[PDB]
Scaffold this active site. Structure first.
Site, PDB file in Angstrom:
ATOM      1  N   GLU A   1       0.864  -1.203   0.000  1.00 36.17           N
ATOM      2  CA  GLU A   1       0.000   0.000   0.000  1.00 36.17           C
ATOM      3  C   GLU A   1       0.876   1.220   0.000  1.00 36.17           C
ATOM      4  O   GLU A   1       0.534   2.255   0.578  1.00 36.17           O
ATOM      5  CB  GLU A   1      -1.046  -0.010   1.129  1.00 36.17           C
TER       6      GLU A   1
ATOM      7  N   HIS B   1      -5.446   2.269   0.353  1.00 36.14           N
ATOM      8  CA  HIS B   1      -4.793   3.263  -0.493  1.00 36.14           C
ATOM      9  C   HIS B   1      -4.585   2.728  -1.900  1.00 36.14           C
ATOM     10  O   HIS B   1      -4.292   1.532  -2.081  1.00 36.14           O
ATOM     11  CB  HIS B   1      -3.448   3.651   0.114  1.00 36.14           C
TER      12      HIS B   1
ATOM     13  N   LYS C   1     -11.056   4.747   6.475  1.00 35.29           N
ATOM     14  CA  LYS C   1     -10.189   5.700   5.762  1.00 35.29           C
ATOM     15  C   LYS C   1      -9.810   5.175   4.369  1.00 35.29           C
ATOM     16  O   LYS C   1      -9.322   4.033   4.239  1.00 35.29           O
ATOM     17  CB  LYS C   1      -8.902   5.937   6.538  1.00 35.29           C
TER      18      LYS C   1
END
Ligand code: CL
Ligand code: CL
Lengths: 253, 251
Positions: free
Chosen positions: B85, B142, B169
């Site tokens: 990530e 991400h 997130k």
């Protein structure tokens, strides 16, 4: 490719978005005190909201007021704007009166730009745009919706029609009812800017909810934004000092 | 609902500012933490993956302690960002889960970051473990190359909630200006239809900076800034970030 618009030596369409502020005065006395109060404010273009001026139908008075602003504010381009009652303005005028007023502004030699509403009538708009350009006066062609946000496609169609009618700078302001509406305005701005625009455009989503649209013009493609010195001329305008602060941060980030 | 870590209430008012601390040795970690003392931020994220000796348990917990000794009034978020990530080193799932469990058990951190795509059972067990020790969990994902469609961004945020994240997130990379708006659309949709806790979303790079600034309106509860060095593309200086957030809050 996008050409720029230069008004009294300010180049619109390059760099950070330009700041426009509206001056509102009911009498010649108010116009002068407000102009003095705006003198040191940090903005780029001065818009005179003529519809706030009482009895605009007395030609000599409007001229006197224009002359008064022009002598106090010597370092900024002046935009003459009569906002019609139809689009949130403070006064009613006939189409004929509206066109005569703008033509009077053009031939005065006191204004650098005039604001003409897109939906005034195609024939009257073409004629007035021609008349302005013949006197070296730029035209911001505008449309406003204070109740809702039209579909992105309709927003893009209006901005495109403004280009077709000869606007130097197409301008549209819409009212968001939802957060999605703000994104719809930004989508239209991006699509217009990337696919059809060949000159600077101005777009905004009004109210606190739409404030972000007044700050992100550099990435999304709006060439100017309105701020307030004391009182806003349309909902969502923040202080010109705060506006310049954010625009600079975004320009250099 | 909100998430309270110490006296900080996440999900209320202006978005909270998180900054990442990056250091290879204990001395680097101390140097950075001292430098961060004056910066204006709300949550200190320690990017554990930048630390050179993460497999030496004694070293990692000494570094965490060092940070907590210096930054005593801000919640500390423990984040090992995996190579997959975009992080600084590769670990096996086992090592990564053991590292996070050790962080939770230390009592030195207020929050841990767990990557959504670590493996469902491991994520559930570690979330349960963190919660048993009163440690909050930011669950993350991400993509440094593209922006998934809005429906997939929402699905991921929803999965994070299902797995027990205190704060979902997601960070995505715009290839176009429209991609920035796709991230914002997904944020609005999540917030208005599915969210029952605070979420953090961002479109990376300078092109997506609006997403780091407009959380109060669109629904992102926190935003990352940079003190001197960014931990991901598009982060702006913490001072400038606070200025903009405040202006937007006071408008
Ligand atoms: Cl406006
Ligand atoms: Cl980030």
């Amino acid at each position: 490719a996008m050409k720029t618009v230069t008004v009294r030596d300010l180049v619109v369409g390059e760099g950070a978005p330009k700041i426009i502020v509206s001056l509102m005065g009911k009498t010649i006395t108010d116009v002068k005190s407000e102009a003095l109060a705006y003198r040191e404010a940090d903005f780029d273009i001065l818009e005179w909201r003529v519809d706030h001026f009482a009895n605009v139908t007395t030609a000599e008075s409007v001229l006197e007021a224009a002359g008064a602003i022009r002598e106090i504010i010597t370092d900024k381009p002046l935009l003459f704007t009569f906002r019609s009652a139809k689009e949130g303005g403070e006064q009613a005028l006939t189409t004929g009166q509206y066109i005569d007023l703008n033509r009077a502004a053009v031939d005065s030699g006191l204004v650098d730009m005039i604001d003409l509403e897109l939906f005034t009538g195609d024939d009257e708009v073409k004629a007035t745009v021609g008349y302005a350009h013949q006197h070296n006066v730029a035209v911001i062609m505008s449309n406003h919706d204070f109740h809702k946000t039209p579909a992105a496609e309709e927003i893009v169609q209006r901005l495109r029609k403004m280009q077709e009618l000869g606007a130097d700078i197409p301008k549209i302001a819409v009212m968001p009812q939802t957060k999605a509406d703000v994104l719809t305005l930004l989508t239209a701005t991006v699509e217009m800017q990337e696919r059809y625009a060949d000159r600077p455009i101005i777009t905004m989503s009004m109210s606190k909810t739409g404030v972000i649209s007044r700050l992100a013009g550099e990435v999304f493609g709006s060439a100017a934004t309105f701020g307030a010195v004391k009182k806003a001329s349309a909902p969502g305008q923040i202080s010109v000092a705060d506006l310049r602060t954010v625009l600079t941060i975004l320009h250099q980030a």
